[PDB]
């Protein structure tokens, strides 16, 4: 009936209450200087993630690239590999800003 056999939980270690299951922590950090920290639901091709970032900034179909691990993957699949738990990190490379700078 009690929370713990010993007596009571410290509650200090456990702060807040989040599922941290359905949603995951996916972020990107280009060489140029990008820092984005947000969580996205894991139930659709990773496309529904980079698509927002890419469209609201730039499309990978040129300079920007999305490296899931150590290679390139299509944006038309979800069960191919993904299968992330929470700490999802994707590396990207930006050859050019695509604006302002001449190159």
């Amino acid at each position: 009936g009690s929370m713990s056999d010993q007596e009571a939980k410290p509650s200090t270690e456990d702060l807040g209450d989040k599922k941290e299951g359905e949603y995951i922590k996916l972020k990107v950090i280009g060489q140029d200087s990008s820092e984005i920290h947000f969580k996205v639901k894991m139930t659709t091709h990773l496309k529904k993630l980079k698509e927002s970032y890419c469209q609201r900034q730039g499309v990978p179909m040129n300079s920007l690239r999305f490296l899931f691990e150590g290679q390139r993957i299509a944006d038309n699949h979800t069960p191919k590999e993904l299968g992330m738990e929470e700490e999802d990190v994707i590396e990207v490379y930006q050859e050019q800003t695509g604006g302002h700078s001449t190159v």
Partner: protein
């Protein structure tokens, strides 16, 4: 043992080349989608009975 995946999933009604049957919950079947999204571990036993290929 290991066999085919000839089964179905009652969470989304979309069987997928794979089926895990959770014992503890019994009569509980999950596919690659619900399992990955829900995150339901519980020592599941892969049940199949078709042709693997």
């Amino acid at each position: 043992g290991q066999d085919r995946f000839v089964y179905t999933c009652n969470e989304c009604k979309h069987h997928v080349e794979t089926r895990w049957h959770c014992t503890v919950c019994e009569d509980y079947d999950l596919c690659i989608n619900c399992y990955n999204t829900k995150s339901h571990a519980h020592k599941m036993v892969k049940w199949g009975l078709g042709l693997d290929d």
